[PDB]
């Protein structure tokens, strides 16, 4: 609905705030995976025997 979005524009930057917070959470999850698992920059291999 176009007029609903026009009325939503009068509420200000609420949607921008929610999108920014969720983007911060989304990059925070990837950062969490980097801190836990990406602790070595060398990919070590087990010997074949």
């Amino acid at each position: 609905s176009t007029e609903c979005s026009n009325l939503l524009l009068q509420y200000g930057s609420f949607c921008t705030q929610l999108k920014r917070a969720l983007t911060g959470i989304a990059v925070e999850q990837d950062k969490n995976t980097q801190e836990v698992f990406a602790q070595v920059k060398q990919i070590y291999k087990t010997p074949p025997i």
Binding site: A38, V40, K41, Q42, I43, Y44, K45, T46, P47
Partner: protein, 50 residues
């Protein structure tokens, strides 16, 4: 596709060891935030003004 890192096959055997013959004194930085900006809000002046 992003590279995880350089492959490094460690030369493992059951009777070989690697002993360091030298060292590096390495200084690194760790930056940690401690405090924020302390803010106060006059609620009546913000909502209503005068």
């Amino acid at each position: 596709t992003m590279s995880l890192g350089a492959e490094n096959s460690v030369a493992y055997s059951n009777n070989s060891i690697a002993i360091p013959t030298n060292f590096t004194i390495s200084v690194t930085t760790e930056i940690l935030p401690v405090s924020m900006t302390k803010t106060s809000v006059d609620c009546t002046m913000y909502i209503c003004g005068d």
